[PDB]
Write a protein that binds this ligand. Sequence first.
Ligand SMILES: [Mg+2]
Ligand SMILES: [Mg+2]
Ligand SMILES: [Mg+2]
Ligand SMILES: [Mg+2]
Ligand SMILES: [Mg+2]
Ligand SMILES: [Mg+2]
Ligand SMILES: [Mg+2]
Ligand SMILES: [Mg+2]
Ligand SMILES: [Mg+2]
Ligand SMILES: [Mg+2]
Ligand SMILES: [Mg+2]
Ligand SMILES: [Mg+2]
Ligand SMILES: [Mg+2]
Ligand SMILES: [Mg+2]
Ligand SMILES: [Mg+2]
Ligand SMILES: [Mg+2]
Ligand SMILES: [Mg+2]
Ligand SMILES: [Mg+2]
Ligand SMILES: [Mg+2]
Ligand SMILES: [Mg+2]
Ligand SMILES: [Mg+2]
Ligand SMILES: [Mg+2]
Ligand SMILES: [Mg+2]
Ligand SMILES: [Mg+2]
Ligand SMILES: [Mg+2]
Ligand SMILES: [Mg+2]
Ligand SMILES: [Mg+2]
Ligand SMILES: [Mg+2]
Ligand SMILES: [Mg+2]
Ligand SMILES: [Mg+2]
Ligand SMILES: [Mg+2]
Ligand SMILES: [Mg+2]
Ligand SMILES: [Mg+2]
Ligand SMILES: [Mg+2]
Ligand SMILES: [Mg+2]
Ligand SMILES: [Mg+2]
Ligand SMILES: [Mg+2]
Ligand SMILES: [Mg+2]
Ligand SMILES: [Mg+2]
Ligand SMILES: [Mg+2]
Ligand SMILES: [Mg+2]
Ligand SMILES: [Mg+2]
Ligand SMILES: [Mg+2]
Ligand SMILES: [Mg+2]
Ligand SMILES: [Mg+2]
Ligand SMILES: [Mg+2]
Ligand SMILES: [Mg+2]
Ligand SMILES: [Mg+2]
Ligand SMILES: [Mg+2]
Ligand SMILES: [Mg+2]
Ligand SMILES: [Mg+2]
Ligand SMILES: [Mg+2]
Ligand SMILES: [Mg+2]
Ligand SMILES: [Mg+2]
Ligand SMILES: [Mg+2]
Ligand SMILES: [Mg+2]
Ligand SMILES: [Mg+2]
Ligand SMILES: [Mg+2]
Ligand SMILES: [Mg+2]
Ligand SMILES: [Mg+2]
Ligand SMILES: [Mg+2]
Ligand SMILES: [Mg+2]
Ligand SMILES: [Mg+2]
Ligand SMILES: [Mg+2]
Ligand SMILES: [Mg+2]
Ligand SMILES: [Mg+2]
Ligand SMILES: [Mg+2]
Ligand SMILES: [Mg+2]
Ligand SMILES: [Mg+2]
Ligand SMILES: [Mg+2]
Ligand SMILES: [Mg+2]
Ligand SMILES: [Mg+2]
Ligand SMILES: [Mg+2]
Ligand SMILES: [Mg+2]
Ligand SMILES: [Mg+2]
Ligand SMILES: [Mg+2]
Ligand SMILES: [Mg+2]
Ligand SMILES: [Mg+2]
Ligand SMILES: [Mg+2]
Ligand SMILES: [Mg+2]
Ligand SMILES: [Mg+2]
Ligand SMILES: [Mg+2]
Ligand SMILES: [Mg+2]
Ligand SMILES: [Mg+2]
Ligand SMILES: [Mg+2]
Ligand SMILES: [Mg+2]
Ligand SMILES: [Mg+2]
Ligand SMILES: [Mg+2]
Ligand SMILES: [Mg+2]
Ligand SMILES: [Mg+2]
Ligand SMILES: [Mg+2]
Ligand SMILES: [Mg+2]
Ligand SMILES: [Mg+2]
Ligand SMILES: [Mg+2]
Ligand SMILES: [Mg+2]
Ligand SMILES: [Mg+2]
Ligand SMILES: [Mg+2]
Ligand SMILES: [Mg+2]
Ligand SMILES: [Mg+2]
Ligand SMILES: [Mg+2]
Ligand SMILES: [Mg+2]
Ligand SMILES: [Mg+2]
Ligand SMILES: [Mg+2]
Ligand SMILES: [Mg+2]
Ligand SMILES: [Mg+2]
Ligand SMILES: [Mg+2]
Ligand SMILES: [Mg+2]
Ligand SMILES: [Mg+2]
Ligand SMILES: [Mg+2]
Ligand SMILES: [Mg+2]
Ligand SMILES: [Mg+2]
Ligand SMILES: [Mg+2]
Ligand SMILES: [Mg+2]
Ligand SMILES: [Mg+2]
Ligand SMILES: [Mg+2]
Ligand SMILES: [Mg+2]
Ligand SMILES: [Mg+2]
Ligand SMILES: [Mg+2]
Ligand SMILES: [Mg+2]
Ligand SMILES: [Mg+2]
Ligand SMILES: [Mg+2]
Ligand SMILES: [Mg+2]
Ligand SMILES: [Mg+2]
Ligand SMILES: [Mg+2]
Ligand SMILES: [Mg+2]
Ligand SMILES: [Mg+2]
Ligand SMILES: [Mg+2]
Ligand SMILES: [Mg+2]
Ligand SMILES: [Mg+2]
Ligand SMILES: [Mg+2]
Ligand SMILES: [Mg+2]
Ligand SMILES: [Mg+2]
Ligand SMILES: [Mg+2]
Ligand SMILES: [Mg+2]
Ligand SMILES: [Mg+2]
Ligand SMILES: [Mg+2]
Ligand SMILES: [Mg+2]
Ligand SMILES: [Mg+2]
Ligand SMILES: [Mg+2]
Ligand SMILES: [Mg+2]
Ligand SMILES: [Mg+2]
Ligand SMILES: [Mg+2]
Ligand SMILES: [Mg+2]
Ligand SMILES: [Mg+2]
Ligand SMILES: [Mg+2]
Ligand SMILES: [Mg+2]
Ligand SMILES: [Mg+2]
Ligand SMILES: [Mg+2]
Ligand SMILES: [Mg+2]
Ligand SMILES: [Mg+2]
Ligand SMILES: [Mg+2]
Ligand SMILES: [Mg+2]
Ligand SMILES: [Mg+2]
Ligand SMILES: [Mg+2]
Ligand SMILES: [Mg+2]
Ligand SMILES: [Mg+2]
Ligand SMILES: [Mg+2]
Ligand SMILES: [Mg+2]
Ligand SMILES: [Mg+2]
Ligand SMILES: [Mg+2]
Lengths: 185, 58, 159, 55, 172, 56
Amino acid sequence: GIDHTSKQHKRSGHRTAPKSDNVYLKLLVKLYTFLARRTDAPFNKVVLKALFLSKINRPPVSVSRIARALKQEGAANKTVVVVGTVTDDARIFEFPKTTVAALRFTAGARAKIVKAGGECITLDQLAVRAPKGQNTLILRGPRNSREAVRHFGMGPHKGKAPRILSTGRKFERARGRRRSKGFKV
Amino acid sequence: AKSKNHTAHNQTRKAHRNGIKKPKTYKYPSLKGVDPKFRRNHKHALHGTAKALAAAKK
Amino acid sequence: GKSHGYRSRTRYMFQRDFRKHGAVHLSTYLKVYKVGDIVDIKANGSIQKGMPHKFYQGKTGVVYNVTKSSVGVIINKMVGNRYLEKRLNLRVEHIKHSKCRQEFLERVKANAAKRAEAKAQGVAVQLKRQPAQPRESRIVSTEGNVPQTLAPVPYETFI
Amino acid sequence: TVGPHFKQANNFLWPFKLSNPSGGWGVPRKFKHFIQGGSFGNREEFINKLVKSMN
Amino acid sequence: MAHFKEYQVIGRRLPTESVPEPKLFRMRIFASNEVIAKSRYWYFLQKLHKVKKASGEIVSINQINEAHPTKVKNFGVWVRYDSRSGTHNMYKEIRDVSRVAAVETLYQDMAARHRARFRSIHILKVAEIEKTADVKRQYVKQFLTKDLKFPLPHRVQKSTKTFSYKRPSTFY
Amino acid sequence: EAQHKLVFVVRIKGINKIPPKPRKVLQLLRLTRINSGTFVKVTKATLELLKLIEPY
RNA sequence: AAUUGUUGAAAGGGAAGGGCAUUUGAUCAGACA
RNA sequence: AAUACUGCCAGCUGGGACUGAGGACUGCGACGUAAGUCAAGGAUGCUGGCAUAAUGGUUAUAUGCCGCCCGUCUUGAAACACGGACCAAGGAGUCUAACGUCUAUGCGAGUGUUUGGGUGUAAAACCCAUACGCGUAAUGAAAGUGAACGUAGGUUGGGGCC
RNA sequence: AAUAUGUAAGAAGUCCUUGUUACUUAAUUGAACGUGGACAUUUGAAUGAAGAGCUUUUAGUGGGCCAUUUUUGGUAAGCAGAACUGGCGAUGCGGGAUGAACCGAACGUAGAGUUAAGGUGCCGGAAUACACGCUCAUCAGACACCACAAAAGGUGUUAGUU
RNA sequence: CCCUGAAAAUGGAUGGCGCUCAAGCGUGUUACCUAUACUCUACCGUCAGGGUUGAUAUGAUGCCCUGACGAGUAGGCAGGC
RNA sequence: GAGAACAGAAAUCUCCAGUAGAACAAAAGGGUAAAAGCCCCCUUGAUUUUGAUUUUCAGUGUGAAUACAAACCAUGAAAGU
RNA sequence: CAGUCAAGCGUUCAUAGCGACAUUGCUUUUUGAUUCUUCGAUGUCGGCUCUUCCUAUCAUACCGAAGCAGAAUUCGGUAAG
RNA sequence: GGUUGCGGCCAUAUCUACCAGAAAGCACCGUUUCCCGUCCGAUCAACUGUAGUUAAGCUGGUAAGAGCCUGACCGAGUAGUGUAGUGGGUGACCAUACGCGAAACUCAGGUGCUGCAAUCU
Ligand SMILES: [Mg+2]
Ligand SMILES: [Mg+2]
Ligand SMILES: [Mg+2]
Ligand SMILES: [Mg+2]
Ligand SMILES: [Mg+2]
Ligand SMILES: [Mg+2]
Ligand SMILES: [Mg+2]
Ligand SMILES: [Mg+2]
Ligand SMILES: [Mg+2]
Ligand SMILES: [Mg+2]
Ligand SMILES: [Mg+2]
Ligand SMILES: [Mg+2]
Ligand SMILES: [Mg+2]
Ligand SMILES: [Mg+2]
Ligand SMILES: [Mg+2]
Ligand SMILES: [Mg+2]
Ligand SMILES: [Mg+2]
Ligand SMILES: [Mg+2]
Ligand SMILES: [Mg+2]
Ligand SMILES: [Mg+2]
Ligand SMILES: [Mg+2]
Ligand SMILES: [Mg+2]
Ligand SMILES: [Mg+2]
Ligand SMILES: [Mg+2]
Ligand SMILES: [Mg+2]
Ligand SMILES: [Mg+2]
Ligand SMILES: [Mg+2]
Ligand SMILES: [Mg+2]
Ligand SMILES: [Mg+2]
Ligand SMILES: [Mg+2]
Ligand SMILES: [Mg+2]
Ligand SMILES: [Mg+2]
Ligand SMILES: [Mg+2]
Ligand SMILES: [Mg+2]
Ligand SMILES: [Mg+2]
Ligand SMILES: [Mg+2]
Ligand SMILES: [Mg+2]
Ligand SMILES: [Mg+2]
Ligand SMILES: [Mg+2]
Ligand SMILES: [Mg+2]
Ligand SMILES: [Mg+2]
Ligand SMILES: [Mg+2]
Ligand SMILES: [Mg+2]
Ligand SMILES: [Mg+2]
Ligand SMILES: [Mg+2]
Ligand SMILES: [Mg+2]
Ligand SMILES: [Mg+2]
Ligand SMILES: [Mg+2]
Ligand SMILES: [Mg+2]
Ligand SMILES: [Mg+2]
Ligand SMILES: [Mg+2]
Ligand SMILES: [Mg+2]
Ligand SMILES: [Mg+2]
Ligand SMILES: [Mg+2]
Ligand SMILES: [Mg+2]
Ligand SMILES: [Mg+2]
Ligand SMILES: [Mg+2]
Ligand SMILES: [Mg+2]
Ligand SMILES: [Mg+2]
Ligand SMILES: [Mg+2]
Ligand SMILES: [Mg+2]
Ligand SMILES: [Mg+2]
Ligand SMILES: [Mg+2]
Ligand SMILES: [Mg+2]
Ligand SMILES: [Mg+2]
Ligand SMILES: [Mg+2]
Ligand SMILES: [Mg+2]
Ligand SMILES: [Mg+2]
Ligand SMILES: [Mg+2]
Ligand SMILES: [Mg+2]
Ligand SMILES: [Mg+2]
Ligand SMILES: [Mg+2]
Ligand SMILES: [Mg+2]
Ligand SMILES: [Mg+2]
Ligand SMILES: [Mg+2]
Ligand SMILES: [Mg+2]
Ligand SMILES: [Mg+2]
Ligand SMILES: [Mg+2]
Ligand SMILES: [Mg+2]
Ligand SMILES: [Mg+2]
Ligand SMILES: [Mg+2]
Ligand SMILES: [Mg+2]
Ligand SMILES: [Mg+2]
Ligand SMILES: [Mg+2]
Ligand SMILES: [Mg+2]
Ligand SMILES: [Mg+2]
Ligand SMILES: [Mg+2]
Ligand SMILES: [Mg+2]
Ligand SMILES: [Mg+2]
Ligand SMILES: [Mg+2]
Ligand SMILES: [Mg+2]
Ligand SMILES: [Mg+2]
Ligand SMILES: [Mg+2]
Ligand SMILES: [Mg+2]
Ligand SMILES: [Mg+2]
Ligand SMILES: [Mg+2]
Ligand SMILES: [Mg+2]
Ligand SMILES: [Mg+2]
Ligand SMILES: [Mg+2]
Ligand SMILES: [Mg+2]
Ligand SMILES: [Mg+2]
Ligand SMILES: [Mg+2]
Ligand SMILES: [Mg+2]
Ligand SMILES: [Mg+2]
Ligand SMILES: [Mg+2]
Ligand SMILES: [Mg+2]
Ligand SMILES: [Mg+2]
Ligand SMILES: [Mg+2]
Ligand SMILES: [Mg+2]
Ligand SMILES: [Mg+2]
Ligand SMILES: [Mg+2]
Ligand SMILES: [Mg+2]
Ligand SMILES: [Mg+2]
Ligand SMILES: [Mg+2]
Ligand SMILES: [Mg+2]
Ligand SMILES: [Mg+2]
Ligand SMILES: [Mg+2]
Ligand SMILES: [Mg+2]
Ligand SMILES: [Mg+2]
Ligand SMILES: [Mg+2]
Ligand SMILES: [Mg+2]
Ligand SMILES: [Mg+2]
Ligand SMILES: [Mg+2]
Ligand SMILES: [Mg+2]
Ligand SMILES: [Mg+2]
Ligand SMILES: [Mg+2]
Ligand SMILES: [Mg+2]
Ligand SMILES: [Mg+2]
Ligand SMILES: [Mg+2]
Ligand SMILES: [Mg+2]
Ligand SMILES: [Mg+2]
Ligand SMILES: [Mg+2]
Ligand SMILES: [Mg+2]
Ligand SMILES: [Mg+2]
Ligand SMILES: [Mg+2]
Ligand SMILES: [Mg+2]
Ligand SMILES: [Mg+2]
Ligand SMILES: [Mg+2]
Ligand SMILES: [Mg+2]
Ligand SMILES: [Mg+2]
Ligand SMILES: [Mg+2]
Ligand SMILES: [Mg+2]
Ligand SMILES: [Mg+2]
Ligand SMILES: [Mg+2]
Ligand SMILES: [Mg+2]
Ligand SMILES: [Mg+2]
Ligand SMILES: [Mg+2]
Ligand SMILES: [Mg+2]
Ligand SMILES: [Mg+2]
Ligand SMILES: [Mg+2]
Ligand SMILES: [Mg+2]
Ligand SMILES: [Mg+2]
Ligand SMILES: [Mg+2]
Ligand SMILES: [Mg+2]
Ligand SMILES: [Mg+2]
Ligand SMILES: [Mg+2]
Ligand SMILES: [Mg+2]
Ligand SMILES: [Mg+2]
Ligand SMILES: [Mg+2]
Ligand SMILES: [Mg+2]
């Protein structure tokens, strides 16, 4: 037998196909698994994976986050790709041109994207336009804006938000939280 | 009802599963507990050389 | 019950070396430390203030803060199955410059030389350290040196 | 020859996989030194005959 | 410990800047192969000099073939060994035909009569006894008397099948 | 002669009941199973390794 | 079903039953073409 | 001179055993002046026997070797520890309220039709106004105050893209 | 001392130029953070790398026992308590007749071969093999862990010493 | 090496029979026996690395090449009945 | 140790030697000689505000401690403390 | 319960019979120490009965020794018929 | 080279007995009006640098000196120790295998090095 140096029969631990069961999603995967095996172009491997990602690892790219990304230097004509839904944002008053490839655009978002004299491309029209993904700008949403990550890593001096079901005084704001009731965190 | 008292049998075995992580190194470490007077000035002196480099792309 | 205080067990650990007690000699307060110096911790029996804990004795670490009488050293402390970072507020009598790094520097300044002096010559350099290689071929001569036959010797007592 | 590239030339070779020696071991008990009539440690020039029986 | 060969071995205190050409000492080891022989050489040198293998080097290891291997000799042998109660020197006399064939039976005799294994003997000296009557020990002197002869009675024959139809002789 | 510059090592002892340190060197020499066997370049910084695992 | 009578075959020198394998007895599939 | 011993040959050669995976071609070679040939990326050629209980499967028995009673609790059970004579049939992590991580789906700065009304082929499906709930503000015991110096900053790694 | 143990072996490196400040100097002095510039994989030891990093949530467990070495109390204990490692537990296989922990070796289903520990009179596969000695017991002796023997004696015999 | 020192309770244990120039003790030399280990092959399953939507027939969680690994209580998960 | 009326083994005075063989509340172990010991002088920093840090650690708490920051003070010629 | 050395006891004389100081053992009908087995249970003193075994033999058989004249005793061997 | 003020390392500088020290420097040394402190102008303070001295301080040399320092195949590859065995032994303990390796001991050699600044036949 063998002094094993590594845990045998290990599973790789990366998704290998979306866990979702959407026919259309799985078609997109066939588009891109093909594209990615036969194109030697980065952007096809990144997109392929990201299509496998769960809702939590697909935070919404907002429309204003997109707006901003174009203001990067020399970026204003690239076509932005959001593997996941894209949300509207009344907080920008203006919004530029460009062309947004995305899994979904909300009602509000394509409105503003089109209203600005723009285009909303589903992920497979982007394939045709940019087989090597030429001239793309991939955005990710923010993954740790999630509520849950607040409560992760809780413990003393981590300043990390109780799992608590009402709040207010009377709700975990005395002993062990203040110098004058026992101690502090 | 006396019972074993203490031991350390089988605790380097366990230590070396997930195996004593190396300490993790960060360029730009924390200033935690560095001289409060040093920091006051340094904050002002960082604010200065900042300014001097926006004035440098004018 | 058992005893377990801050200085316990440190009997000889904190003692003074032989015929070396009394005040400490002034170079100890002359040496200058700035952030990033490597230091060797060794408590001084005679300076009770700002004394390292017995644990960090013989442990090296790096100064992260410099202050009127003291350096701030961080030291990596493997507790459990990990290492934590501890910052230690030592006094100058208890710290010292680690020569651990000298050999590096005396070899990097030297690794500059050999590099320039050879590049400006016509390449070929090789300046990586190599372990001790086995010995080569040799002829050990016999002239003025005939071999001297030895034997084992019987069993004596002498007492 | 242990030439300039012996590290990558050597590690390229997947660790060898010998049989138990054909003749047998010639010792009676193996886990003593070679000098002490067992099988382990450096036996030098003789590591061969051993190997050419395990191959 | 095995079937023995004699080896001269030669080593010398690894040279230094201020002592190149150190001095060279030889032993004659009685061993089975050359790897044991050098082991013994260092075993014994560190019993006389400030050396170890770590700091010296073998200069030459050479087998020594018996000079007249069809000349029966009378060998005196000098030994030091450890018993279960202390250590002691000895002297025996072995009649055989090469220094090495004698060292073989020595280690056997030492083992059978004095339960001493290889690890506890030291071969102080082996020497060809020139003139007879310097042969001290009796179990040897028996074989040096003139026109010596002797029968081999009650001779016993190695039967090659399980059953026999005769009934043996021991005649001779 | 020149001291030998290259060594060949074959693992003799089986897999189990082996102490932590040499049990490590056996790995770094890729000798993780009985009767397999690798070459090793002879230098002090491995000669010590070689030492550390003679019983096996 | 436990348990029972009959009948039939078979084994049984201080339990019975099981594993690997084969002899022998009984019984059976497939496969030729 | 020989021999022994130790070592090497990409020197010849006999007997014996187990395997025969693969299924067009494709590779690296080898022999030939050449045509072709080959043992070169896994067995083919020739000859015979039965076409059946011959081979094979099941089963009873016998023979070689091996085989302690299972369940449990225990450092340790075949235990001189407990339950268990045998059979059948019942026989043990549920449902609910309120929650954590995770995942799927919908919609998204909002989201939730189902208290209710409308309506129906009537406990279904279909539809819906007003609120409400959670979210979109925080922080202080409270009175209270309340998120752009700046391309929503600077630095250092960052996939991807240019 | 041995064994054990802290740090270091570069790009987060090195060298020149000279910017910021409210700290700090007698002092543009220094400290700290910087802009501009010079040198690439022999870029600074060896061996390995079926990659490395990272997060969230949850089971069982929280009676332990043995072996070598170190080691405390006890005359001791198959006793009670520590240290390091290896084990048993949770693990079958081969050896130790027998046996949780010893030796060997760790298990997918098979075939051929070679072995380990241990063995080869017969039981029992395998030399009533070879070679030198020793031993004769009117309670011989016979293989680690292991299933116990001591001081003291012998003109049994053996080989040695002065 | 052997003997004496050497006394317990059912009858009994170098495992048994038995063995005495041993089948005993020390030591040496070879040959030989056989584990679920080692080497080679086959098959199963696991993990991994690659190849392959081009229609006009049948599976794209599919097909094809390749390598390595396989002990297991409490316990996790998976895929199935 | 060698010296001085009563004065004795021990009262007080002097000189020499003296690495600490003393003392520092307390157990013990460290530590300390122009001191950390003894005699003196001036004192309240045994103070105010709130963080970091070490040991114990879960890297909670409590206890104790270190080094800064910001006050107001003590001492001293001063560096300082 | 049994030894070894033998200073001594024994008129004399170490060992007929004993034996200090020391030291080596054995036994498991003492008593301790331990808590491995049994707490969904091994009926728990003594006697009665009756069997068998051990020997560290009290008697009986045959012996060696004696500080055995005889008689009595004593130490010892083979001995549990 | 000397000396002095300030030093660094802190006995190769220390301890004991002698001896030598030119020049300048240090010293001892003279006084008590004044600041200042003492039971005591001894120490501490002031004034003189005049009135005296190399006695001592101080510097250096001596010694089969003590101490301290350095070294060596001096002891010693010893003691201890990491690793190995189904090694030996009733045990107590002990050989051997691959490595690491003391302390004492004994002999030799040594007896302050040196920085800043002023000064000196
Ligand atoms: Mg995902
Ligand atoms: Mg994200
Ligand atoms: Mg929020
Ligand atoms: Mg959460
Ligand atoms: Mg709250
Ligand atoms: Mg705190
Ligand atoms: Mg209890
Ligand atoms: Mg207990
Ligand atoms: Mg416990
Ligand atoms: Mg205590
Ligand atoms: Mg202590
Ligand atoms: Mg002192
Ligand atoms: Mg204090
Ligand atoms: Mg064979
Ligand atoms: Mg052969
Ligand atoms: Mg063999
Ligand atoms: Mg054996
Ligand atoms: Mg072979
Ligand atoms: Mg040897
Ligand atoms: Mg030696
Ligand atoms: Mg010896
Ligand atoms: Mg024969
Ligand atoms: Mg290697
Ligand atoms: Mg190496
Ligand atoms: Mg070696
Ligand atoms: Mg019967
Ligand atoms: Mg047909
Ligand atoms: Mg030959
Ligand atoms: Mg050949
Ligand atoms: Mg075929
Ligand atoms: Mg085929
Ligand atoms: Mg040709
Ligand atoms: Mg061909
Ligand atoms: Mg048929
Ligand atoms: Mg048939
Ligand atoms: Mg048929
Ligand atoms: Mg047939
Ligand atoms: Mg037929
Ligand atoms: Mg039947
Ligand atoms: Mg059957
Ligand atoms: Mg059986
Ligand atoms: Mg059962
Ligand atoms: Mg129990
Ligand atoms: Mg048990
Ligand atoms: Mg059971
Ligand atoms: Mg029982
Ligand atoms: Mg129970
Ligand atoms: Mg029952
Ligand atoms: Mg049922
Ligand atoms: Mg139930
Ligand atoms: Mg879940
Ligand atoms: Mg969704
Ligand atoms: Mg809203
Ligand atoms: Mg409804
Ligand atoms: Mg109704
Ligand atoms: Mg309607
Ligand atoms: Mg309404
Ligand atoms: Mg609402
Ligand atoms: Mg909220
Ligand atoms: Mg707020
Ligand atoms: Mg407040
Ligand atoms: Mg107000
Ligand atoms: Mg502002
Ligand atoms: Mg403002
Ligand atoms: Mg910066
Ligand atoms: Mg040592
Ligand atoms: Mg290390
Ligand atoms: Mg400026
Ligand atoms: Mg630059
Ligand atoms: Mg490296
Ligand atoms: Mg590598
Ligand atoms: Mg990899
Ligand atoms: Mg858990
Ligand atoms: Mg838990
Ligand atoms: Mg508990
Ligand atoms: Mg728990
Ligand atoms: Mg429990
Ligand atoms: Mg011990
Ligand atoms: Mg115990
Ligand atoms: Mg073990
Ligand atoms: Mg384990
Ligand atoms: Mg258990
Ligand atoms: Mg286990
Ligand atoms: Mg096991
Ligand atoms: Mg077995
Ligand atoms: Mg075995
Ligand atoms: Mg073994
Ligand atoms: Mg039998
Ligand atoms: Mg047989
Ligand atoms: Mg008997
Ligand atoms: Mg007897
Ligand atoms: Mg008996
Ligand atoms: Mg017998
Ligand atoms: Mg033994
Ligand atoms: Mg046994
Ligand atoms: Mg005795
Ligand atoms: Mg004896
Ligand atoms: Mg004798
Ligand atoms: Mg003798
Ligand atoms: Mg014998
Ligand atoms: Mg019985
Ligand atoms: Mg016996
Ligand atoms: Mg036998
Ligand atoms: Mg026998
Ligand atoms: Mg024998
Ligand atoms: Mg042979
Ligand atoms: Mg043979
Ligand atoms: Mg096996
Ligand atoms: Mg198999
Ligand atoms: Mg695929
Ligand atoms: Mg499994
Ligand atoms: Mg299944
Ligand atoms: Mg089903
Ligand atoms: Mg008086
Ligand atoms: Mg008190
Ligand atoms: Mg004290
Ligand atoms: Mg002072
Ligand atoms: Mg007083
Ligand atoms: Mg207070
Ligand atoms: Mg804490
Ligand atoms: Mg915590
Ligand atoms: Mg903690
Ligand atoms: Mg912790
Ligand atoms: Mg608490
Ligand atoms: Mg404290
Ligand atoms: Mg006695
Ligand atoms: Mg006596
Ligand atoms: Mg007498
Ligand atoms: Mg007498
Ligand atoms: Mg008398
Ligand atoms: Mg006597
Ligand atoms: Mg006993
Ligand atoms: Mg007993
Ligand atoms: Mg009794
Ligand atoms: Mg119990
Ligand atoms: Mg009991
Ligand atoms: Mg019971
Ligand atoms: Mg009962
Ligand atoms: Mg009972
Ligand atoms: Mg009963
Ligand atoms: Mg009862
Ligand atoms: Mg008499
Ligand atoms: Mg009478
Ligand atoms: Mg009478
Ligand atoms: Mg008698
Ligand atoms: Mg009777
Ligand atoms: Mg009887
Ligand atoms: Mg003068
Ligand atoms: Mg004065
Ligand atoms: Mg003078
Ligand atoms: Mg003079
Ligand atoms: Mg002076
Ligand atoms: Mg001297
Ligand atoms: Mg020794
Ligand atoms: Mg050792
Ligand atoms: Mg072992
Ligand atoms: Mg042993
Ligand atoms: Mg003893
Ligand atoms: Mg050694
Ligand atoms: Mg000496």
